[PDB]
Design a protein around this ligand. Structure first.
Ligand SMILES: *[C@@H]1O[C@H](CO)[C@@H](O[C@@H]2O[C@H](CO)[C@@H](O[C@@H]3O[C@H](CO[C@H]4O[C@H](CO)[C@@H](O)[C@H](O)[C@@H]4O)[C@@H](O)[C@H](O[C@H]4O[C@H](CO)[C@@H](O)[C@H](O)[C@@H]4O)[C@@H]3O)[C@H](O)[C@H]2NC(C)=O)[C@H](O)[C@H]1NC(C)=O
Ligand SMILES: *[C@@H]1O[C@H](CO)[C@@H](O[C@@H]2O[C@H](CO)[C@@H](O[C@@H]3O[C@H](CO[C@H]4O[C@H](CO)[C@@H](O)[C@H](O)[C@@H]4O)[C@@H](O)[C@H](O[C@H]4O[C@H](CO)[C@@H](O)[C@H](O)[C@@H]4O)[C@@H]3O)[C@H](O)[C@H]2NC(C)=O)[C@H](O)[C@H]1NC(C)=O
Ligand SMILES: *[C@@H]1O[C@H](CO)[C@@H](O[C@@H]2O[C@H](CO)[C@@H](O[C@@H]3O[C@H](CO)[C@@H](O)[C@H](O)[C@@H]3O)[C@H](O)[C@H]2NC(C)=O)[C@H](O)[C@H]1NC(C)=O
Ligand SMILES: *[C@@H]1O[C@H](CO)[C@@H](O[C@@H]2O[C@H](CO)[C@@H](O[C@@H]3O[C@H](CO)[C@@H](O)[C@H](O)[C@@H]3O)[C@H](O)[C@H]2NC(C)=O)[C@H](O)[C@H]1NC(C)=O
Ligand SMILES: *[C@@H]1O[C@H](CO)[C@@H](O[C@@H]2O[C@H](CO)[C@@H](O)[C@H](O)[C@H]2NC(C)=O)[C@H](O)[C@H]1NC(C)=O
Ligand SMILES: *[C@@H]1O[C@H](CO)[C@@H](O[C@@H]2O[C@H](CO)[C@@H](O)[C@H](O)[C@H]2NC(C)=O)[C@H](O)[C@H]1NC(C)=O
Ligand SMILES: CC(=O)N[C@@H]1[C@@H](O)[C@H](O)[C@@H](CO)O[C@H]1O
Ligand SMILES: CC(=O)N[C@@H]1[C@@H](O)[C@H](O)[C@@H](CO)O[C@H]1O
Ligand SMILES: *[C@@H]1O[C@H](CO)[C@@H](O)[C@H](O)[C@H]1NC(C)=O
Ligand SMILES: *[C@@H]1O[C@H](CO)[C@@H](O)[C@H](O)[C@H]1NC(C)=O
Lengths: 419, 419
């Protein structure tokens, strides 16, 4: 197609929970709150937000923790955009129960437009996607929800791509699909119109200038019902990175189940499981898996992880290591619900970078909405090296433990560890 | 199609090595030597044998063990059929090296016809199939080679189906394929003629009278190049039994590798591996795997077995147990090469019976020749119950050990056990 001449600059943003300290103070990345506040300050034309839920203040959480100031500050700034003329459009998954939306109603009276999307009817899933589009020039893609706990209590990772007009405009078309479906009584068309179609797929990714160095990038979405003809499915993009890896594969995802969860009877789903086994056996690829464990983790997830870590010995010449990332929690942090977990969902190889917003279960690629960014770059350094250094910081950390560790040793209440 | 009115009677024959004693003397099945000698005594019209190799006497083994008398007796009887007018046709895989054939030349001068089939060129494999066809009325299908060690030193299992003219004639067409390929300069046709075509596939198995009770049976062969249009591939038949099981799956096979062995680079082959994982997860099927370990077992096979036995806990509600069958060997038995192993290759479910002649690796269904018999029967009892009782005798035996057993404990030299 046509190349993008915009001076695209990519910044890796992550939120470090209070109490998590890394002695190797060498990465130094901006926090999600700092990036969000900077994005809101420079917004003057439009702002498109796709979110799972809105719990940006202490009222919805029904708590009195003083760590919600950063979350409240974002909400305070969001209420000032509409008066200045910024077209704020928010797509939020419709809650299952009758939960009041104090934050969304606050923005509704300010002048924003909020639309609830019934994923449970259209695709029998939810809207797990999380991204921003500011002025169609800068976009944020990551795992951070609209929580005050997502900025100070949980550990996350996202990417803010500045001054990339061509790439942000591609993300808008994904948001246009949710905006169209948010309309009451609107069903999924058999074929999407050209408006939502894209020409930058896996086969022909777009060419950008990431910090000067040329690179190839393309966006992959889910579920298929919503993907137009030119959009690469998220599972296909995920498997392509695993198939093309030749040296190593680094995966840090909160949950990994090779099963269609919720759907009963238990459906087996060996899509990503087979890709990892092929990589380590057929090729000399070393695979490192970093999974997050907390009180609400599925206990069935351990059996499928022990079945994967078993394939590592001299005879088979395979190398799979599985480690659990447990965020320590004291009594004060334990009182906050859904507050101490590692939320990062991304994959790093020796040649490609994958950053997604959906877990690695079966429903997140067939029923649940989601979006992932795939950037490849020639030569050493760049975004891939920065992301690789983050993974190694987590891997060689006191908060990452093996699968045979006693559950008392870790700071939190891990359900995947025996005794 | 048309049903078979022949009074088909099926007998399970197995060879028990010297020194192997089962206190539960309740099965009582005839030995392979007894069945073979009875088959040869009643042969008057024809005899078709498909074999891997011929080592029926002490000369080829270059040993002086007195346990080869049974093997020599079979060879002595085989030399008398041709004088009586029996048309003896033998298909034997061509040896890789220049190994002399003392047994085959002995039969050649008697009047038999011996043809060597170059599987290493036609399908880049070997002729691992093992079956007999006596007078086109009685056929033996099993794992027993033409060894004197296959009758007294190794443990095997086969089925002799008496008075089944319709079923034996179906097995002849498989032998006709090897006979056609045994001709020098004969290549695999693109489409087999009608002569080798069959009408009793998995979709429409033939109806027989197994000991009076009606039953459905069909033969499955390999590799596909040799399977005509109407012949069910062996892998498809094997996977159908696993897919249709609802209560339990009992598997006793010498080697189980989800990889295309020999073929390099290491090719992954999760065909049967995925079927077993689906059965235990999606359904409440209990899977029991009995693998044979000896000095020549592939050490890489342990990692793929530990990766399968890991999927068994309350949370996942799965039940996979893997055990190793080790035939004890003293100093005298150790001196005999390739002499102390469990050679049985069969699968038992709650509704179907599978008896095959090929291991469960990747090459035995794509390159290597092989044949399997699939018999299903309504109601309790019959062949399936007899085969199930054999498996439980092996499972609850002192010669079957778990994967964590020390390698010194077992009587033989097992390469799959640590320390
Ligand atoms: C492509 O181009 C983009 C745009 O320039 C680059 O993005 C920059 O990345 C660098 C490095 O990650 C960023 O610099 C770092 O910022 C961190 C966070 O900034 C805040 O830090 C404190 C936190 O309280 C605030 O007080 C402060 O005002 C900032 O708002 C800093 O913490 C980092 O400093 C720490 O780490 C370094 C080592 O990394 C130590 O040497 C320091 O002493 C200190 O401990 C650091 O300054 C920069 O902010 C990003 N730019 C933007 C606009 O966000 C991409 O990195 C680039 N791509 C590549 C591959 O180079
Ligand atoms: C469908 O129809 C066929 C045809 O009849 C049946 O096949 C018969 O199966 C039975 C049971 O397996 C066979 O009977 C058994 O034979 C064993 C081996 O026979 C030899 O045994 C000794 C070994 O040295 C020789 O001396 C002897 O002369 C035989 O040549 C015996 O060992 C068995 O006896 C032992 O076990 C039983 C318990 O099983 C004990 O009670 C005994 O005391 C003893 O310990 C037994 O006699 C029979 O031979 C088979 N027939 C043929 C023609 O081979 C199928 O079983 C049938 N299908 C079903 C489902 O019933
Ligand atoms: C995305 O593109 C915009 C547009 O170029 C970038 O903004 C520009 O950033 C530079 C760097 O700070 C600014 O230069 C500075 O100007 C001040 C005077 O205002 C001067 O004192 C400094 O020494 C420096 O030269 C530039 O003014 C600014 N332009 C605009 C219109 O804001 C922006 O930085 C880019 N995004 C990222 C993440 O870099
Ligand atoms: C396969 O079919 C043949 C043909 O029927 C079976 O052979 C028959 O077996 C019966 C049972 O032993 C024989 O009956 C016996 O006859 C003798 C006299 O010879 C008698 O003294 C016995 O009391 C008994 O009645 C029958 O003669 C025999 N027929 C032939 C032609 O051999 C054979 O048994 C069947 N196969 C199997 C495994 O059963
Ligand atoms: C694969 O082989 C390597 C090299 O032998 C093993 O690495 C060392 O092995 C020796 C003995 O085999 C141990 O004493 C060392 O502790 C091992 N070092 C490390 C860093 O592991 C390795 O253990 C073997 N197995 C695997 C799964 O790599
Ligand atoms: C699955 O649950 C069953 C029932 O609780 C377990 O069976 C017994 O479990 C208790 C405690 O959980 C043990 O003390 C017994 O020794 C178990 N009996 C047997 C025969 O195992 C069973 O262990 C659990 N796990 C699996 C894989 O079945
Ligand atoms: C929903 C809610 O609690 N609203 C309170 C209101 O009751 C109180 O009067 C006011 C002054 O503090 O602050 C706000
Ligand atoms: C190949 C071989 O050893 N053949 C032997 C022969 O040498 C010997 O003369 C004969 C008498 O025992 O027995 C046979
Ligand atoms: C809820 O919001 C109100 C006003 O926005 C304020 O009182 C406070 O921030 C929250 N808590 C309570 C108890 O009202
Ligand atoms: C080989 O066969 C011959 C004759 O068949 C006989 O001597 C014996 O059975 C075997 N062994 C030796 C040493 O010849």
């Amino acid at each position: 197609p046509a190349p993008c001449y915009d001076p695209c600059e990519a910044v890796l943003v992550e939120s470090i929970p209070e109490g998590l300290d890394f002695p190797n103070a060498s990465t130094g990345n901006p926090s999600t709150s700092q990036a969000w506040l900077g994005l809101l300050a420079g917004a003057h034309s439009s702002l498109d937000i796709a979110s799972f839920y809105w719990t940006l203040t202490n009222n919805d959480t029904h708590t009195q923790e003083p760590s919600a100031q950063q979350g409240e500050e974002v909400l305070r700034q969001l209420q000032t955009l509409a008066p200045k003329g910024v077209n704020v459009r928010i797509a939020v998954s419709k809650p299952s129960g009758p939960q009041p939306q104090a934050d969304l109603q606050a923005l509704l009276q300010s002048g924003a437009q909020v639309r609830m999307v019934d994923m449970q009817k259209l695709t029998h899933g939810v809207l797990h996607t999380k991204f921003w589009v500011v002025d169609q020039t800068h976009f944020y893609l990551g795992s951070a929800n609209m929580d005050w706990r997502s900025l100070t209590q949980v550990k996350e990772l996202g990417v803010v791509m500045y001054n990339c007009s061509c790439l942000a405009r591609d993300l808008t078309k994904i948001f246009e699909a949710y905006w169209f479906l948010g309309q009451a009584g609107s069903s999924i068309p058999s074929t999407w119109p050209r408006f939502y179609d894209t020409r930058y797929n896996q086969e022909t990714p777009m060419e950008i200038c990431l910090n000067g160095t040329p690179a190839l990038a393309y966006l992959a979405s889910a579920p298929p019902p919503l993907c137009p003809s030119g959009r690469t499915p998220d599972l296909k993009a995920l498997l392509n990175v695993v198939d093309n890896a030749r040296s190593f594969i680094y995966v840090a995802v909160m949950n990994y189940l090779p099963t269609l969860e919720f759907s009963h009877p238990h459906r087996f789903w060996p899509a990503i499981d087979d890709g990892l086994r092929r990589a380590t056996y057929e090729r000399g690829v070393k695979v490192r898996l970093l999974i997050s464990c907390w009180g609400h983790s599925e206990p069935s997830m351990r059996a499928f992880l022990l079945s994967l870590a078993a394939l590592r010995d001299n005879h088979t010449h395979s190398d799979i290591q599985v480690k659990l990332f447990v965020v320590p929690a004291d009594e004060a942090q334990a009182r906050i619900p859904y507050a101490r977990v590692n939320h990062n969902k991304y994959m790093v190889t020796e040649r490609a970078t994958y950053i997604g917003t959906s877990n690695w279960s079966g429903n997140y690629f067939t029923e649940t909405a989601g979006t992932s960014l795939l950037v490849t770059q020639n030569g050493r350094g760049g975004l891939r090296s920065q992301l690789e250094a983050i993974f190694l910081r987590d891997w060689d950390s006191p908060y990452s433990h093996d699968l045979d560790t006693s559950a008392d040793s870790v700071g939190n209440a891990c359900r995947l560890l025996l005794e």
